[PDB]
Amino acid sequence: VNSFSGYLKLTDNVYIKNADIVEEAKKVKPTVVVNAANVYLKHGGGVAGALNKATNNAMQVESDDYIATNGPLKVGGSCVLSGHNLAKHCLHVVGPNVNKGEDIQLLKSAYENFNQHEVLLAPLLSAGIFGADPIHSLRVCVDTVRTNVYLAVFDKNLYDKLVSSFL
Ligand SMILES: CCc1c[nH]c2ncnc(N3CCC[C@H](Cc4nc(C)no4)C3)c12
């Protein structure tokens, strides 16, 4: 038993809700919140900009130190950093950005990072400003992630299309 509420169960291990991941995060304090990161961990907009703003820019300060030490992430890769006031940990995962021409097949690799964590609060990778089809992202998610994932979908209209179209 865990503390997530109001989710619809899609599969054995994947759940979905219409929710603001920031507000969902501040209420659950999950062990892991996933950030929709880029390779530079520049949290300017989308999910990342929202999570970072909610941390009072502390996520960005920590991220800049991480990059200065380690260099950029790989597309499809991830790193674990602090969750600040939102979660114990933030898993920054780099899905491919279609608006940069990155290979959508890397989306499966991106979701594989979720399997290193037993339970996660997460957005749909490569959705939103990353330019992928969210219906496809949900499919790859269901077919790749084996751990328990609670997907927060900000847009109510999108949430309903994803549920109604889910096979
Ligand atoms: C500000 C956006 C936001 C606020 N609060 C949220 N809560 C859940 N999801 C959210 N996003 C919508 C946009 C796309 C994003 C997915 C994705 N961005 C990139 C790059 N690649 O994928 C997810 C949000």
Curated annotation (Swiss-Prot):
Residues 1-167 form the Macro domain. It is a multi-pass membrane protein. This is Papain-like protease nsp3. Inhibited in vitro by GRL-0617. It catalyses: Thiol-dependent hydrolysis of ester, thioester, amide, peptide and isopeptide bonds formed by the C-terminal Gly of ubiquitin (a 76-residue protein attached to proteins as an intracellular targeting signal). May form homohexamers. Interacts with N protein. Responsible for the cleavages located at the N-terminus of the replicase polyprotein. Participates together with nsp4 in the assembly of virally-induced cytoplasmic double-membrane vesicles necessary for viral replication. Antagonizes innate immune induction of type I interferon by blocking the phosphorylation, dimerization and subsequent nuclear translocation of host IRF3. Also prevents host NF-kappa-B signaling. In addition, PL-PRO possesses a deubiquitinating/deISGylating activity and processes both 'Lys-48'- and 'Lys-63'-linked polyubiquitin chains from cellular substrates. It is found in: Host endoplasmic reticulum membrane. It comes from Severe acute respiratory syndrome coronavirus 2 (2019-nCoV). The chain holds residues 1025 to 1191 of 7096 of the full protein.
